[PDB]
Design a protein around this ligand. Structure first.
Ligand code: BGC
Ligand code: BGC
Ligand code: CA
Ligand code: CA
Lengths: 761, 767
């Protein structure tokens, strides 16, 4: 049908259309309408755009630390740059264009613009441009650009490679060397810190015959074509931009030249990309019946998750994906807790490879732990190629003094480690993949249990272990003790480790133990900690205290009342002396995050009482927060409140609602964790899907705004399809080697055999 | 035999004189030139001064928390206010007066002014005024004020009780009620928080036969005497100001009036004060030969220490004494570590009472530990009447933002508890007072050991205990782990508790264990801690790390270069994001403080390497710091370096060298810990005096600036006097005379069984 928001609509449920150009909203648009394929992201700019419009092509595995502090992915030369003059006048976007639309077609990752603007000579010029990053040939991004005049006119088209690109924390590439090949130009350059080679090759094909002249200068190269446009006769340019680095392959320039030489036409490459995207959507599409706005917003988020996910090499999903350099193209706990579940239940080999990325980087976690005085694996807060910590000590500034502030994201926020062990165990429960636990997952869980045993303190007069001096998911409170989320998660790891010691076969167990030198003394300490570690529990009013002493901080309800205490609008809110430090205002889900990860650990009334206590004290100043409260709301029958938090979460980028800057650091770009959680809110939230042992739970609720929804979930290799209407719930076991399962729908057991099982409200 | 600084001089080494009036120096001058007697402090203002000149009389045991945050002593109505007009023109000090001096006579606590100023009618008026707080009648402060003109003239003298007095954190008295008595006026008021009664009584005698009209307003009472002054004929006014509270007596108004009734003349009261002061100087005086500036600065310091010390009731010595309300008139670790030693060696009953004050307040320490989730005794950082914590959570503000900052003086600076255990053990070593350990000290040491055991964490993969998230004596670095000073002091306390459990007789030991419920399981934890607690040790270069990760912070030498980073000059330098937080610059001695308390803990080379490493990293922003470096330096025969820090320390108040405002909070007033430390630097630092049961040790060093020094000590009831010069040392025993006295002078034993021993002394500058 209709209207999403600003001036955005959908016509099909698969497309987002913006029909007014406004330069204020251009750029937010560069993120939202971007294209990509897990190897690169190419911002949704128009072919004339460069550094002033924040154009960028961000490429995986090109980390560089040129400014001496921020290691982030490189932005590379732009081989799609294309500039039009019409009788001398440059074509420049105006808000008064006779006609403007930009469209992102989510069914195939094709982004485009159609614009008509009358020029000073009277000619009305129409440009249609479309671009996509090939999911078939992941090193290539392709464009078709067509210009048409309604009136005979001369014009000039320049096209080439722009070296002078936007980069947030210093230019990452130096030493640019021009070269030519039969279909265009190329540039090879080297990164600043590691001196890796990056090559961009441009191919260019123009359908009109015209004298053409090349140019090469220190800021780019290219060629110019004078055109005689005839009334109503369009001229089409097709370009490919191909990128390889020495981290992808041995002699990248050679390789980029071969990929260029064998590239097929724009249309042939477009059809092959469409076939790959049909296959992606067959895994991940979730349908929503009779709410096309919600339907398209969900597809927008899943689309953004997919294009942020590297599948060509063992690499992290960035917390802003490849939409820009913010958050360093690197993995945070968002990767396992927010992004992995869609993959776990829809295409588990992708989840396995996420976890294998954490295995591959376990040495970085071992070195981090040792550097900080611990043992085991303390995973990096911000993980890039090797697993060494990329998060600086001074992430932010105190904007009131101009001084760096020391936030302990990188060394007190320890929950990253047991979050990884949790994800290992979840992946094992859902898939039944024993071999993963034998070869990789058991070693991971035990090194994480060893780390937690080395961080913990024992308090002999209280007879208990405690986790002191931490930062929990609510990052604004640092230096807290016995954060409830972290304590519980630590106990779930130790419990998983204890289970493996009792359950693995003796040969696998001996091998893992000898590999990581695990002693009987440590195993005894883990079992002592399982029996005596303090875990925050519900008080006489049902409330789980967020960390020790949180109840004595100042109650401010609702939490945004604290924003009245700001002196400058862009002050960091948290430690050491931000406005929230001695208040109960929290950045995001912390106790409520516990219930998302462990939905049946506490009973529905305890979860409700904690929801009703913490929601009004949460700022939701991380994109991670609204979806956690949506998922918990859906399952204590606060469905309409869940729906509202669903909308907050699915619309964060589309309708632009979160802070670009905080404490002097750029925080903006696409919110990849929120993209992942879109799927979770429907399937784990409204659907109530969770897996305990052999036990599959479903509890499907239905927002009043929808007439139904449907999703697939793969549990123990069985592909199930769950369809929810007003009246009923249908579960179909699709699949060749089909086995019996056993459900729990709204708390009743009902052994599934073979395609029947309809039940009601 | 004259210049100290500014326009400050001494004539005899017993007096300090300032011969220029500077209105900007009033806060400093009124502290330095004050009078007092341990019961009150009366700032050294002149008789016409009030709120604008920071006049104050600060009275012990009148704590009030009117503003809801700072509990501080009350400033009370001023019964010495005296204003002169000459032919209708008010007498106002001019910075260009014909003649001016103020004098503090340290021999007897008398502070005075003589001033001559020419008035508009041409008369030159001379005022001579002196005041003292009686050490004989501790509730009385007296004044004699004399005016004379070289020209016949009308004058008016208005004298009375000013109620409108300066108070730092809000007015503390309300309900002021005027009354009269045969020799003047009085006022009775009540404190805001606790509704305690305070009465001030004024007595007033004028030796001119002129008549008087009285006035009573809401801001004060008094009377005006219109005079006809005769050229060359002085007029004298004598007053007493008497103060009682209902924390001192049941009926303070009656007692103040009974005191008034039995007052003698100004001159008789002054003579009785003189006698008390002769007795005090006979215990505490330390003389220095041929350096009259160091001699007077030493007596000025000792004097301030004496008048800050309450001897009339069980009360703390305040960290700014009674010089003003700053630091809450309350005890800090300063009291045991800085002020106690002169008393310990010179008049040990006073040290015993300092420790009994800490025993009396053990319940406030136990409530503080419980409130913070610990057990045993976590003493208050700032202790007043009860021992409950007086230090606010929000001591300072971030002056860049105006917001409060949370510093953890009151809940992470845990060394206060083992500092008190240390002072209990030191007191016992010096005095052999077993009875104190039976009745009081073993209970204190065990509750402090129980607290430390409750604070520590055990690291099972490291196999050891550690003390995490503390703040050491260097207050600027908070949230540090294994501060060396703290970890060693904790192990000394557990060692002392362990020694008592293994040594005390079964009767005394059962009574204490039963009183505090000390369990065998607790004892086994202390003994496990003794065997397995991490204690920072010297590294391959001999240096003990101040806390974990200190060596990774930024080196700035000289440390003062760090103040170039300041954005406002009065910012707090420390936590959470002050300019020193991520640097090696330290507020005050911290590793070096450990060697002050434990001079043989490590060999001389190790102490020297740490001194050389840390002294250039020290800002000495705190007045506690230079004396610690002087003592450590003197103990390792770095005599001239010890003398450089001695000179810095003794002049801190006299030359106004330290900051008065920080982080938006007033921290000025007289620096009582530094005043107490003056005596230790000479006697324990240069003298090397220490006393361990029967053995008395001296290791007398002599700075090149002095030709000798002498001091007294009272060891197991024998009064010893020691005279050190470059070429010899004499020791006399001047008492009732029990022969058993054993002395070690450097390595050599003497039995002091005659009345005088004389030994030659060699130079002990280290080569
Ligand atoms: O998305 C990366 C990070 O963004 C932050 O603002 C959130 O507080 C973190 O929980 C999250 O991991
Ligand atoms: O004198 C009272 C307090 O003053 C502070 O400035 C010092 O850093 C403390 O060590 C001292 O205890
Ligand atoms: Ca072809
Ligand atoms: Ca409710």
């Amino acid at each position: 049908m209709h209207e999403i928001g600003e001036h955005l609509t959908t016509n099909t449920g698969w497309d987002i259309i913006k029909n007014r150009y406004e330069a204020a909203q251009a750029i937010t648009e560069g993120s939202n309408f971007m294209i990509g394929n897990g190897f690169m992201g190419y911002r949704g700019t128009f072919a004339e755009d460069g550094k002033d419009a924040y154009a960028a092509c961000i490429v995986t595995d090109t980390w560089d630390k040129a400014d001496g502090k921020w290691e982030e992915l490189s932005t590379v030369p732009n081989a799609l740059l294309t500039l039009l003059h019409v009788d001398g006048e440059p074509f420049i976007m105006s808000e008064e264009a006779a006609s403007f639309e930009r469209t992102l077609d989510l069914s195939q990752g094709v982004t485009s613009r159609k614009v008509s603007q009358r020029m000073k000579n009277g000619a009305t010029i129409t440009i249609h441009e479309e671009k996509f990053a090939s999911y078939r040939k992941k090193h290539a991004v392709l464009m078709k650009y067509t210009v048409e005049s309604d009136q005979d006119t001369d014009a000039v088209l320049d096209t080439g490679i722009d070296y002078d690109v936007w980069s947030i924390n210093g230019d990452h590439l130096q030493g640019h060397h021009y070269f030519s090949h039969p279909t265009g130009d190329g540039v090879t350059a080297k990164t600043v810190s590691y001196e890796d080679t990056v090559t961009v090759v441009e191919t260019c094909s123009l359908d009109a015959d015209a004298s053409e002249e090349d140019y090469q200068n220190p800021d780019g190269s290219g060629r110019t074509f004078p055109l005689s446009l005839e009334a109503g006769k369009p001229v089409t340019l097709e370009k490919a931009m191909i990128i390889y680095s020495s981290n992808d392959v041995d002699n990248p320039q050679d390789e980029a030249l071969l990929e260029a030489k064998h590239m097929q036409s724009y249309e042939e490459e477009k059809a092959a990309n469409r076939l790959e995207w049909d296959n992606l959507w067959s895994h991940y599409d979730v349908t929503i019946q009779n709410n096309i706005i919600d339907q398209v917003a969900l597809r927008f988020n899943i689309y953004h998750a997919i294009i942020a996910t590297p599948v060509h090499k063992s690499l992290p999903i960035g917390a802003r994906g490849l939409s820009c350099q913010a958050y360093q193209g690197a993995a945070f706990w968002d990767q396992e807790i927010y992004n992995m579940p869609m993959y776990l239940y829809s295409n588990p080999e992708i989840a396995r490879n996420i976890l294998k990325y954490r295995h591959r980087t376990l040495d970085g976690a071992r070195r981090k732990a040792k550097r900080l005085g611990y043992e085991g694996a303390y995973y990096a807060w911000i993980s890039g190629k090797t697993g060494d910590e990329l998060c600086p000590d001074f992430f932010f500034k105190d904007v009131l003094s101009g001084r760096d502030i020391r936030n302990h994201f990188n060394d007190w926020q320890i929950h990253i480690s047991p979050d990884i062990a949790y994800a290992v165990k979840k992946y094992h429960q859902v898939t039944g993949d024993d071999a993963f636990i034998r070869d990789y997952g058991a070693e991971m869980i035990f090194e994480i249990a060893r780390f937690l045993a080395s961080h913990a303190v024992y308090k002999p007069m209280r007879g208990r272990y405690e986790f002191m001096r931490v930062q929990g998911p609510d990052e604004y409170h640092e230096n807290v003790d016995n954060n409830a989320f972290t304590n519980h998660q630590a106990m779930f790891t130790l419990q998983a480790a204890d289970e493996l010691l009792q359950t693995l076969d003796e040969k696998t167990l001996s091998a893992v133990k000898e590999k990581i030198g695990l002693s009987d003394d440590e195993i005894s300490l883990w079992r002592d900690m399982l029996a005596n570690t303090y875990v925050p529990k519900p008080d006489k009013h049902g409330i789980i205290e967020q960390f020790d002493g949180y109840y004595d901080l100042e109650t401010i309800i609702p939490a945004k009342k604290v924003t009245e205490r700001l002196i400058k609008e862009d002050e960091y809110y948290g430690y050491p002396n931000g406005v929230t430090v001695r208040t109960q205002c929290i950045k995001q889900a912390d106790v409520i995050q516990l219930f998302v990860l462990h939905p049946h650990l506490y009973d529905r009334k305890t979860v409700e009482l904690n929801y009703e206590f913490y929601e009004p004290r949460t700022l939701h100043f991380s994109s991670l927060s609204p979806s956690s409260y949506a998922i918990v709301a859906a399952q204590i029958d606060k469905v309409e409140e869940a729906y509202r938090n669903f909308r907050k979460s699915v619309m964060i980028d589309l309708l632009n609602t979160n802070e670009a800057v905080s404490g002097g650091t750029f925080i903006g770009g696409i919110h990849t964790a929120a993209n992942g959680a879109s799927w979770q809110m429907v399937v784990n939230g409204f659907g109530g899907l969770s897996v305990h042992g052999d036990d599959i739970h479903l509890s499907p609720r239905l927002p009043d705004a929808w007439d139904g929804y449907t999703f697939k979930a793969i549990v123990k290799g069985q592909t199930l399809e769950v369809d929810v209407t007003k009246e009923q719930i249908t579960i179909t076991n699709k699949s060749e080697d089909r086995k019996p399962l056993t459900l729990h729908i709204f708390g009743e057991k009902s052994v599934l055999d073979s395609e029947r099982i309809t039940k009601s409200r």
